[PDB]
């Protein structure tokens, strides 16, 4: 019984849409040459800035703040990259063959070749973008999916069985069911038949497994550069996630 | 129009069930000590033997042989490990805390600690097994899911856009929709309401994203041992997949 399981389909949608994060710009001098900037440095700087905003977004996803601090952290540490990728793919949907990492930063596959291992990832992201185009993915659907990833990605890795942990997983699976009801709701409204509904649902959810795959590939690349000497992501997340209530 | 898109739910189920592969045994001398055998050597030998049988299984999955040789190969090269894992998890469903890799080879997490990186994977597989138990996963559902993985895992990585390739992807997405219809069918029969249906469907499909994750982790481990000097999996698959029609 909470301000999460009570909501109706349209309430969840509105909640998710209003919670959407902003679209950041790549930080580079626009009046200066380009073959000067570090593509990676740019992508990394952008991701880091977006993370800060991803936290605000998560806290506004119905049911998320009802969880424990550490559970909230685990889920984000597990899904952060997939969340960034789906957003990226969503933005690029209307730019065939390009990835709109930022309004002032559109890259085609050729531009991903200046870095080892990056070209493969760019092609998977582009292919995902085309898939969405093909499916005519809607913004209402996009938000549900992105919220689904936040909750589902790290739910199978809680290396705990305490009573509290069982109550936590139950809650998560309950919220996910509500998001499922919403997606179906959004489809019935649209005019899709019942068959087309369960079919579109499957099609969308199965894309999530490819997004997971892209994150793993991305984690591999990321983890090959940085070294075991940097505040482990867990902590940064914890610091930003464990906020006080002073700036009332 | 083919012996695939024509079938009815019960026909697909029967097809999938009758096509099930056999349960192989680990090859080791049962009358000899155990701390003697190579855990990895055993797991690798088993997987290799199962692959041979996975090919026969795939060829019997409705719609699979209508695809081109190379497409059939790509899909298997992409999903083989996930297929082995789901099967493994399915077998272990009635053995809390253990992984029944084979009837004569049951291992708990302690036994996975004799090898670097393996303990993490054992825990993800065990957690998946528990999840299925919890969901009371049915054998009819299991086969649909395993078939879904075969078709969905590598469909987003066909680095081709020829007309033939578009016709190939269309076919795959059409078969997948049929498997979706089957799953729903299997649930309505069971007595689940329409809400519980789309909800159970979501729950099952979302598990597939975790199975993908386990494969990536497994591929990382596998790829860290063997060396770039072994008949690349593509070829073994091609050889076994490109069969003649002489043993009529
Ligand atoms: C993490 C990487 C840099 C940042 C990239 C990014 C940065 C911002 C964003 O919104 C999405 C993505 C998706 C792919 C990410 C890349 C995968 C490999 C690279 O290390
Ligand atoms: C591929 C590995 C050996 C074979 C293992 C196996 C072997 C047979 C099988 O039916 C399932 C699995 C799942 C995990 C696999 C392992 C993941 C890491 C290891 O290299």
Swiss-Prot record, chains A, B:
Provide the binding site for 17beta-estradiol: 50, 91, 221
Modification after translation, per record: Phosphorylated by cyclin A/CDK2 and CK1. Phosphorylation probably enhances transcriptional activity. Self-association induces phosphorylation. Phosphorylated by LMTK3 in vitro.
Q: Which subcellular locations apply to this protein? A: Nucleus; Golgi apparatus; Cell membrane
Tissue specificity remark: Widely expressed. Not expressed in the pituitary gland.
According to the Swiss-Prot or TrEMBL entry, at which residues is a lipid covalently attached (S-palmitoyl cysteine)? 144
**Impact of mutating residue 144 to A?**
Loss of hormone binding capacity and temperature-sensitive loss in DNA-binding
Region (Self-association) location: 1-248
Phosphotyrosine carried by residues: 234
Region (Transactivation AF-2), start-end ranges: 8-248
Outline the segment boundaries, as ranges, of region: Interaction with AKAP13. Answer: 1-248
Domain (NR LBD): residue spans on this chain:
8-244
Outcome, altering residue 72 to H: In ESTRR; results in highly reduced activity
Q: Which family does it belong to?
A: Belongs to the nuclear hormone receptor family. NR3 subfamily.
Q: What is known of its domains?
A: Composed of three domains: a modulating N-terminal domain, a DNA-binding domain and a C-terminal ligand-binding domain. The modulating domain, also known as A/B or AF-1 domain has a ligand-independent transactivation function. The C-terminus contains a ligand-dependent transactivation domain, also known as E/F or AF-2 domain which overlaps with the ligand binding domain. AF-1 and AF-2 activate transcription independently and synergistically and act in a promoter- and cell-specific manner. AF-1 seems to provide the major transactivation function in differentiated cells.
Report further notes: Selective estrogen receptor modulators (SERMs), such as tamoxifen, raloxifene, toremifene, lasofoxifene, clomifene, femarelle and ormeloxifene, have tissue selective agonistic and antagonistic effects on the estrogen receptor (ER). They interfere with the ER association with coactivators or corepressors, mainly involving the AF-2 domain.
Q: What does this protein do?
A: Nuclear hormone receptor. The steroid hormones and their receptors are involved in the regulation of eukaryotic gene expression and affect cellular proliferation and differentiation in target tissues. Ligand-dependent nuclear transactivation involves either direct homodimer binding to a palindromic estrogen response element (ERE) sequence or association with other DNA-binding transcription factors, such as AP-1/c-Jun, c-Fos, ATF-2, Sp1 and Sp3, to mediate ERE-independent signaling.
Linked pathology: Estrogen resistance: A disorder characterized by partial or complete resistance to estrogens, in the presence of elevated estrogen serum levels. Clinical features include absence of the pubertal growth spurt, delayed bone maturation, unfused epiphyses, reduced bone mineral density, osteoporosis, continued growth into adulthood and very tall adult stature. Glucose intolerance, hyperinsulinemia and lipid abnormalities may also be present.
Subunit-structure text: Binds DNA as a homodimer. Can form a heterodimer with ESR2. Interacts with FOXC2, MAP1S, SLC30A9, UBE1C and NCOA3 coactivator. Interacts with PELP1, the interaction is enhanced by 17-beta-estradiol, the interaction increases ESR1 transcriptional activity. Interacts with EP300; the interaction is estrogen-dependent and enhanced by CITED1. Interacts with CITED1; the interaction is estrogen-dependent. Interacts with NCOA5 and NCOA6 coactivators. Interacts with NCOA7; the interaction is a ligand-inducible. Interacts with PHB2, and UBE1C. Interacts with AKAP13. Interacts with CUEDC2.
In its UniProt entry, what is this protein called?
Answer: Estrogen receptor
Query: What species is given as this protein's source?
Result: Homo sapiens (Human)
The gene from which this protein is expressed is ESR1
First-to-last residue of the parent protein present:
304 to 551 of 595
